[PDB]
């Protein structure tokens, strides 16, 4: 296949700077143009810029709302493209999609989230949600863990280091009046007692370089 992965996302204060990087794979970097498209939160797709191949002089073009504040860079020797963002404002908060440009946009990256905000970064508090037969409207028991009071988005959640996926339901985050996010991941499970089965939720808050592995145990 082809893969495009971005990085360097998270929080930046207005007027501060934040550089994104995007690594290519399964595609020859040298001959393919690279582009960035921005998905402002709850808004449409807005084009950030494009950077032409080495053989054309590594030319660049930007969207008007961006031009003069962002500079788009390249490096084939390291097999990556860089998006530099200099003058930043709350209006720039968005998901930034790394993409290839061809003669339209053929390949798309998973997208990095840049949250421009004067608010401070906060790593989550993580509590186990004890397994219970009486927790669900439905038939079976459920257990999970609560990812509480973090900023900014995103946090990602696995169970048993990715080994457990079937029963797993990770919910979208709530934004609290406190200005902090809270998230829950629940797992459907046979019964309120779970001896010999291990249930560890892997909370990864990349924006605060924090990761928490929380094991969920029966309530006394």
């Amino acid at each position: 296949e082809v893969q495009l992965l971005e990085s360097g996302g998270g929080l930046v204060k207005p007027g501060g700077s934040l550089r994104l990087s995007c690594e290519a794979s399964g595609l020859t970097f040298s001959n393919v143009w690279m582009s960035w498209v921005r998905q402002a939160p709850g808004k449409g797709l807005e084009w950030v810029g494009r950077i032409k191949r080495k053989s054309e002089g590594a030319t660049t073009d930007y969207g008007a709302p961006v031009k003069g504040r962002f500079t788009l860079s390249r490096d084939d020797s390291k097999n990556t493209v860089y998006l530099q963002m200099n003058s930043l404002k709350i209006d720039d908060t968005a998901v930034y999609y790394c993409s290839t440009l061809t003669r339209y946009f053929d390949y798309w990256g998973q997208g990095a989230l840049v949250t421009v905000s004067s608010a401070s970064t906060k790593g989550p508090s993580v509590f186990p949600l004890a397994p219970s037969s009486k927790s669900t409207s439905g038939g079976t028991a459920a257990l999970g863990c609560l990812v509480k009071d973090y900023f900014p988005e995103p946090v990602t959640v696995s169970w048993n280091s990715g080994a457990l996926t079937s029963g797993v339901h990770t919910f979208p985050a709530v934004l609290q009046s406190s200005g902090l996010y809270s998230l829950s991941s629940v797992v459907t499970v046979p019964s309120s007692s779970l001896g010999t089965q291990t249930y560890i939720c892997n909370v990864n808050h990349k924006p605060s370089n924090t990761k928490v592995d929380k094991r969920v145990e029966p309530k006394s």
Partner: protein, 210 residues
């Protein structure tokens, strides 16, 4: 500037059209455009390009046509999995800029009642001098719920944080609501309730200090 309809409804099995409307000095004079599909919380995908063509990794039911000013996307044989945001864009030569459309939505016509999960505050959270009730609503349609909290028999508005409904991967919707208390309030009352109303019916869960 490119303009397209905010919302375009359609029934299963049938064919539906989305219009991307441009100007004569852009789309009229030089007729090229590309169309994209974005499922909820996921990367956009190239469905069709250069008005007509389509990669062998794309479902054949997507096709593009056009008039002078406006190019339009037509979907044949609608299904649940077609439910996504749809965008159109255009790029000219060198020393220019890419123009994107506003984004449009499509729809289905089933019906389903919510499953509700409710946990009390963890032992660890209480020891930390905090308390949060977690109420998780899933697998409902339409994507519209009311979540109400009761402390015993008495409604609680304060300390309530409820998400907007969100399209689930199985085409249904999901939502979550958290009630934040002091440990003294939590152990004060005989029982707490998360009460979820959907299409006139209510699913209600209860927890108590234990």
């Amino acid at each position: 500037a490119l303009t397209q309809p905010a919302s375009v409804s359609g029934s299963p099995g049938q064919s539906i059209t989305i219009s991307c409307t441009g100007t004569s000095s852009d789309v009229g004079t030089y007729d090229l455009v590309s169309w994209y599909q974005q499922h909820p919380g996921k990367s956009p995908k190239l469905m069709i390009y250069a008005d007509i063509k389509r990669p062998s990794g794309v479902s054949h039911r997507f096709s593009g046509s056009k008039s002078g000013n406006t190019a339009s996307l037509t979907i044949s044989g609608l299904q649940s999995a077609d439910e996504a945001d749809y965008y159109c864009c255009l790029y000219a030569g060198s020393s220019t800029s890419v123009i994107f459309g506003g984004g449009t939505k499509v729809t289905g016509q089933p019906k389903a009642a919510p499953s509700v999960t409710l946990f009390p505050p963890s032992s660890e959270e209480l020891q930390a001098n905090k308390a949060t009730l977690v109420c998780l609503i899933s697998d409902f349609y339409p994507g519209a719920v009311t979540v109400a909290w009761k402390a015993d028999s008495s409604p609680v508005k304060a300390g309530v944080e409820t998400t907007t409904p969100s399209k689930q991967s199985n085409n249904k919707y999901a939502a979550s609501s958290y009630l934040s208390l002091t440990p003294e309030q939590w152990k004060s009352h005989r029982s707490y309730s998360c009460q979820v109303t959907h299409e006139g019916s209510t699913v209600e869960k209860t927890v108590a200090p234990t």
